[PDB]
């Protein structure tokens, strides 16, 4: 596991262990976006704005439908446990496409209940409606702007007439088109393959997900996961969605640690160890964690899948406490911290930070061969960093550092220019070596001839 | 051209040939955003919110005007075919700036018709208006919120008075400012040089582009191309735009192919060929295609310009079927597919995928020296991958693979850390070689002296 106490000696501050939660399973639910609102004018006044809005929906619903038809790459035994899902198709489908096609053929049995339900949702005015079935969960349908239509436009058609009611529809529906376009328009193939974040659709429709389908961070995670488009009705302008309620389990014996690298001095130049922002353990395992897609709760990270990736370099040996193998890289800017509070004391490179021990006049100098200064409460009662006076914590666990000849031979560059420059220098040295070899071989030929 | 059948043996799945459409020419049209709506209160009630909205427009229109004045870098024979466009200016202008200045001096002849039209648009209340001229196309003007003003605020000034009418104006106009800021505020120099996507302005103003100026994917492409700002009136708060209606032609003898790389096993480790996501042919030519800015129609990619870039590496030889030169790289995560359906069969590396031939109990083992397993319908009737049973397609064209000693010497890294680490190892070996050379040269001196 991580040797946190030794990693501090190179400014690597492994901190904040949090557990990790993974959805072992998903409860599925269906959501039907019925994109056309019903009007009650009894004279087809709103039809003119409905027609142009339909003519806008085409710009999103037809690309979405044409994208979904590519997911018909499993051709259809089925209906039997461990039977054949279907016949492959003449094309190429990657594992992501195959997984999406399998999810579609799992949902395809809904389509007869879809046919049953649309007969209702075609007629109803109610904005959010749920329909029961022989299948366990209720299926819910949202009719896009019905609250606004029945509560505002239905009165306005009488109070203000067809002119204002028509403009109100035009504005509201083209706004709803801009919202739908923000949800459905970008990366359409990925949006079909991987789905749409439930957060966006709920923001479209203020959907009380827990009330519609059934901790704050668990709810945020439920918003972050992607609902898959399972059908798109081009004639009824309806999109059917699979919502995926996660069953979260706390994964045992896992911790995700944050690692912050401060600048490390080598001969009055600033270097740092460019470790990934997060690292994780799984019993004996040690690797990075791509927490970027996860929800950081206060006690655990809720992730859609195990974010761990194995550290390919000596970085694993570095983190395991074999400090001599840590890869150095040069600091570029103020993004790398020059100091940090650690376990009640301070770890900083006092060459580029005015470290003071018991007052702004007593500077804590570090020798040029020491990379970071570890200032425990036993050393200094009131450490001042860049003038900022702080008391060190008397119950701090920051272990005292007897300095040592830590030599970090693994100098590494993050910039392609640096690598190209030093590779050109290596290639020039290699050419010099080849020239020497040619000359010595010629000399060998001459000595042999003689 | 691509040797698709041989590329499969390294998990490179070249697929989905689509043609390519390029706008050989653009029909120009002019659009005048008249940012101030006219009021009809007959008492200047709305003036207070108009003044503050003008005071907001300054935050975008003045930067936009000051940006456009830099495009006055051609100084002004003109008016004669093949005559001098103008005198250069004392500064530096790159080819993009020169192209934008040339486009501005082409549009500059509109400015007398602009002066003629603004006399009308200053007075009219109508939200979208078109004006004819001696030049061929109508020029259209949009007065920002006139529908809302005349249909809602003009009634409200009488029904609710100056107080509510004023608040309605304040809210609507500052919303319109946030929309304008979303369109005009970012990357102002690029926005002047390259223009604004017509999609955004149409979303601002629900503009029926085909109705205003004249297939769904052709319309999407017309939305994706950039309208250039040609004038900005700081006193009238008016922005004049050049809309560019593309004349699309299907380019002959071009195909764009998608390429998906699955993991390829070398000695129980996963590798892949990091080819670009799309490749294109142009007769004998073979290169990549930067389709990111193009519209993917079902039969062709509509691109603003030829996206092709020549493959600088042995990647061209790799794609041409000289498989031994394909560059390997190590897999990093689940983003690289471990298997894919291909032409009715399956191509997968069965070392990290439970491939089964005619039932979940008959695993299709592959020898450690074979990188991918190609499972044709002649081999297996019902291939199961990770438990998922699928029938292979009896009309599939997936050619049967007799395995061979495919050796891929071009090991390549995508991560600067890997390159730096192995360059440091190379440099250390080079230092060892130099030390040996110094020792041998010293020995040569000693033998010569003796």
């Amino acid at each position, epitope marked *: 596991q991580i040797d946190i106490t030794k990693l501090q000696h190179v400014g690597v501050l492994v901190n904040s262990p949090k557990g990790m939660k993974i959805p072992q399973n998903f409860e599925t639910r269906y959501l039907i976006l019925s994109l056309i609102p019903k009007i009650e004018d009894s004279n087809s006044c709103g039809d003119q704005q409905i027609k142009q809005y339909k003519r806008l929906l085409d710009r999103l619903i037809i690309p979405l439908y044409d994208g979904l038809r590519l997911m018909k790459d499993v051709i259809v035994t089925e*209906r039997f446990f461990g039977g054949v899902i279907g016949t492959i198709a003449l094309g190429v489908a990657t594992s992501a496409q195959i997984t999406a096609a399998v999810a579609l053929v799992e*949902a395809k049995q809904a389509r007869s209940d879809i046919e049953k339900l649309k007969e209702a949702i075609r007629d109803t005015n109610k904005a959010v409606q749920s329909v029961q079935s022989s*299948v366990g969960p209720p299926i819910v349908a949202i009719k896009s702007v019905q609250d606004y239509v029945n509560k505002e436009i239905v009165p306005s058609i009488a109070r203000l007439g067809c002119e204002a009611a028509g403009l109100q529809l035009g504005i509201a529906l083209t706004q709803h088109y801009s919202e739908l376009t923000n949800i459905f328009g970008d990366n359409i193939g990925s949006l079909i393959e991987k789905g749409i974040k439930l957060q966006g659709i709920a923001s479209l429709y203020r959907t009380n997900i827990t009330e519609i389908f059934t901790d704050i961070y668990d709810l945020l995670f439920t918003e972050s996961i992607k609902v898959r488009v399972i059908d798109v009705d081009l004639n009824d302008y309806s999109i059917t969605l699979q919502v995926r309620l996660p069953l979260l389990t706390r994964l045992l014996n896992t911790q995700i640690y944050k690692v912050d690298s401060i600048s490390y001095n080598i001969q009055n130049r600033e270097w740092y160890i460019p470790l990934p922002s997060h690292i994780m353990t799984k019993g004996a395992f040690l690797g990075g964690a791509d927490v970027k897609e996860c929800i950081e709760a206060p006690s655990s990270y809720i992730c859609p899948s195990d974010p761990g990736f194995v550290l390919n370099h000596e970085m694993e040996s570095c983190l395991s406490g074999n400090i001599s193998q840590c890869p150095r890289t040069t600091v570029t800017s103020d993004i790398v911290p020059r100091y940090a509070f650690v376990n009640g004391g301070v770890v900083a490179n006092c060459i580029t930070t005015t470290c003071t021990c018991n007052g702004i006049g007593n500077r804590i100098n570090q020798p040029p061969d020491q990379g970071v200064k570890i200032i425990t409460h036993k050393e200094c009662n009131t450490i001042g960093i860049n003038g900022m006076l702080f008391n060190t914590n008397k119950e701090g666990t920051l272990a005292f550092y007897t300095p040592d000849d830590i030599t970090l031979n693994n100098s590494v560059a993050l910039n392609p220019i640096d690598i190209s420059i030093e590779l050109n220098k290596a290639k020039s040295d290699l050419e010099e070596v080849k020239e020497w070899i040619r000359r010595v071989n010629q000399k060998l030929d001459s000595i042999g001839s003689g | 051209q691509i040797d698709i059948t041989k590329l499969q043996h390294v998990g490179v799945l070249v697929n989905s040939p689509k043609g390519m459409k390029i706008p050989q020419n653009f029909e120009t049209r002019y659009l005048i955003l008249s940012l101030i709506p006219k009021i009809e209160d007959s008492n200047s009630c709305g003036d207070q919110q108009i003044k503050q909205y003008k005071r907001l427009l300054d935050r975008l229109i003045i930067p936009l005007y000051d940006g456009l004045r830099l495009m006055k870098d051609v100084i002004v024979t003109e008016r004669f075919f093949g005559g001098v466009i103008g005198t250069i200016a004392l500064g530096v202008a790159t080819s993009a700036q020169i192209t934008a200045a040339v486009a501005l001096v082409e549009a500059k002849q509109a400015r007398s018709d602009i002066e003629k039209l603004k006399e009308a648009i200053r007075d009219t209340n109508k939200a979208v208006q078109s004006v004819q001229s001696s030049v061929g196309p109508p020029i259209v003007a949009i007065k920002s919120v006139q529908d809302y003003v005349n249909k809602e605020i003009v009634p409200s000034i009488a029904r609710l008075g100056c107080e509510a009418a004023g608040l309605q104006l304040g809210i609507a106009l500052t919303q319109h400012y946030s929309e304008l800021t979303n369109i005009f505020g970012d990357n102002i120099g690029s926005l002047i040089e390259k223009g604004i996507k017509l999609q955004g302005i149409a979303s601002l103003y629900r503009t029926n582009i085909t109705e205003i100026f004249t297939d769904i994917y052709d319309l999407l492409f017309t939305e994706s191309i950039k309208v250039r700002v040609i004038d900005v009136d700081l006193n009238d708060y008016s922005i004049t735009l050049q809309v560019r209606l593309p004349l699309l032609t299907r380019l002959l003898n071009t195909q764009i192919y998608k390429v998906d790389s699955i993991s390829y096993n070398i000695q129980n480790r996963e590798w892949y060929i990091p080819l670009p996501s799309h490749i294109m042919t142009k007769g004998a030519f073979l290169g990549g295609a930067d389709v990111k800015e193009c519209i993917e129609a079902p039969s062709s990619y509509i691109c603003p310009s030829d996206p092709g870039f020549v493959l600088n590496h042995e990647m061209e030889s790799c794609l041409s079927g000289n498989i031994s030169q394909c560059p390997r790289t190590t897999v990093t995560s689940d983003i690289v597919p471990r298997y894919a359906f291909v032409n009715g069969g399956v191509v997968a590396n069965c070392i990290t995928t439970t491939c089964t031939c005619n039932g979940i109990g008959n695993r299709i083992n592959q020898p450690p020296d074979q990188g991918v397993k190609i499972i044709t319908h002649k081999e297996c009737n019902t291939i199961g991958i990770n438990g998922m*049973l699928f029938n292979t397609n009896k009309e599939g064209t997936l050619a049967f693979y007799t395995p061979d000693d495919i050796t891929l010497n071009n090991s390549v890294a995508l991560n600067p850390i890997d390159i730096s680490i192995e360059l440091n190892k190379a440099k250390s070996d080079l230092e060892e070689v130099k030390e040996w050379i110094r020792r041998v040269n010293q020995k040569l001196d000693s033998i010569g002296s003796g």
Partner: nanobody
Framework: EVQLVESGGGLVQPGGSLRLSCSASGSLSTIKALGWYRRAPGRERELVASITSAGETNYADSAKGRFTVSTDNAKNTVDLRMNSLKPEDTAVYYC??????????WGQGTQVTVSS
């Protein structure tokens, strides 16, 4: 969607044996595993037994070797055979079907109880 229909529960004498039979229907070709969960009072749903389509079977430490689970794939039924029933085994048993995409489907659950 997978319809799960649990059956065979009720009261039984302690130390007795019982067979719980769940009928599954729908797109079962997409189902990775069929099995049973239990929910005792005051605790979450614990796994009881599961059968993968490959036949591979697993159990919780409370169930290993003690219980046995079976299917009759000709009729899509999954049966859990209960034996040596204890007071500690009383719970609502929930049949489940788990998809390859890790969706989970549940039966209505059957009450299992034992005499005092």
């Amino acid at each position: 969607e997978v319809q799960l229909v649990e059956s065979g529960g009720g009261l039984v004498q302690p130390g007795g044996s019982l067979r719980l039979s769940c009928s599954a229907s729908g797109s079962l070709s997409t189902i990775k595993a069929l099995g049973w969960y239990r929910r005792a009072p005051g605790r979450e749903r614990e796994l009881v037994a599961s059968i993968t389509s490959a036949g591979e079977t697993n159990y919780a430490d409370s169930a290993k070797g003690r219980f046995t689970v079976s299917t009759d794939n000709a009729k899509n039924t999954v049966d859990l055979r209960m034996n040596s029933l204890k007071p500690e085994d009383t719970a609502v048993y929930y049949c489940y079907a788990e998809s390859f995409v890790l969706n989970i489907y549940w039966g209505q659950g059957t009450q299992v109880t034992v005499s005092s």
